[PDB]
Write a protein that binds this DNA or RNA. Structure first.
Ligand SMILES: [Zn+2]
Ligand SMILES: [Zn+2]
Lengths: 51, 51
DNA sequence: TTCATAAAGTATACTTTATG
DNA sequence: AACATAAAGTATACTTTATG
């Protein structure tokens, strides 16, 4: 959970790991400070409001 | 601290300990859910925007 | 023109709800 | 329906700013 990952939605590198979603080590959830949106790495994404 | 303390501002008992201000154990800072204002128990209080 | 303390702000890590 | 996962929410714990 150290490596910095690009945002799949906006492609920025200004991202940060936040927490493991659903108590699962296979669901590392990140945040993209640029698009103000979370994503779960390796999981599916849905269209959420930017902000 | 877990003892519930009355809010010196509005007198309510719906208050909660939150944290030690300034990393000082002598500044236990509480929050009054009623008036929506923080206070440091035993410290000086100032007129702050309620809310 | 510096510092302890009061207030305000923000990151963390959990919990609650939404989605398909 | 219902269940795992995506998203959203929130107590907690820290950091930064304001005040006198
Ligand atoms: Zn992004
Ligand atoms: Zn009060």
């Amino acid at each position: 959970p150290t490596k910095i990952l690009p945002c799949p939605r906006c492609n920025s590198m200004e991202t940060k790991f936040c927490y493991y979603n659903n108590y699962n080590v296979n669901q590392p959830r990140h945040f993209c400070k640029a698009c103000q949106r979370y994503w779960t790495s390796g999981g599916t994404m849905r269209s959420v409001p930017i902000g």
